[PDB]
Design goal:
Layout (H helix, E strand, L loop, with lengths): L1 E8 L6 H10 L11 E10 L2 E10 L6 H10 L2 E7 L3 H18 L6 E6 L10 H11 L3 E3 L8 H20 L1
Parallel strand pairs: 1-3, 1-4, 4-5, 5-6
Antiparallel strand pairs: 2-3
Bound molecules: phosphoaminophosphonic acid-guanylate ester (GNP), the ligand NC[C@@H]1COc2cc(Cl)ccc2O1 and magnesium ion (2 copies).
């Protein structure tokens, strides 16, 4: 029983909620109901550990940056979601990461870059662009589809492995 606080961040409409609901409830939400904030728990076994995941599913846009600051201080790792057909959402990852680092006063923050909607026929953000940026940041990159469930579990479980690695580091 280790608890892990995961926050799912990203621009409007990239699939934050569809990903999270696939993880928690195992179905795909076809509808677009914009999020205020939602909280979910999931117990899972990852590499033999019993993990309690406390997941925050965030809004695409806040009216209040104090709300953004708060989740950024609370989360232990961040699922940084863009959509592969949304350039601006990819670009926004830079901004999220800079804010998170500021708010935490730290260069070392557990994160996973997620390129969602990989089921779509055309992408405007290429996998190589995204892989190269993740390499730069020293974080994993995973392509996902909440529609088909491709990559959903591996995205969240990878973020847990990154938070474990971080705690291991902050010890030594
Ligand atoms: N084809 C496809 N559509 C998807 C995928 N994920 C989400 N969608 C669709 O994209 C729309 C937005 O999804 P949603 O999960 O609500 O996005 P969000 O990032 O949570 N929006 P918000 O920022 O307002 O909370 C919905 O119509 C949803 O079904 C995906 O992987 N593939
Ligand atoms: N309701 C949002 C606040 C701030 O951020 C949170 C982050 C997590 Cl993982 C859980 C609950 C949280 O509470
Ligand atoms: Mg949402
Ligand atoms: Mg957002």
């Amino acid at each position: 029983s280790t608890e892990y606080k995961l926050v799912v961040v990203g621009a409007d409409g990239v699939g934050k909620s569809a990903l999270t609901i696939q993880l928690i409830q195992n179905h795909f939400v076809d509808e677009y109901d914009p999020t205020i904030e939602d909280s979910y728990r999931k117990q899972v076994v990852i590499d033999g550990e019993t993990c309690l995941l406390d997941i925050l599913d965030t809004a695409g846009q806040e009216e209040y940056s104090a709300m953004r600051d708060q989740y950024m201080r609370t989360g232990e790792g961040f699922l940084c979601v863009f959509a592969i057909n949304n350039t601006k959402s990819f670009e926004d990852i830079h901004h999220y990461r800079e804010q998170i680092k500021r708010v935490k006063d730290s260069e070392d923050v557990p994160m996973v870059l997620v390129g969602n909607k990989c089921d779509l026929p055309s992408r405007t953000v290429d996998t190589k662009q995204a892989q190269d940026l993740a390499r730069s940041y020293g974080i994993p990159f995973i392509e996902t589809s909440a529609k088909t469930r491709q990559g959903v579990d591996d995205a969240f479980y990878t973020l847990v492995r990154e938070i474990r690695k971080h705690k291991e580091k902050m010890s030594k």
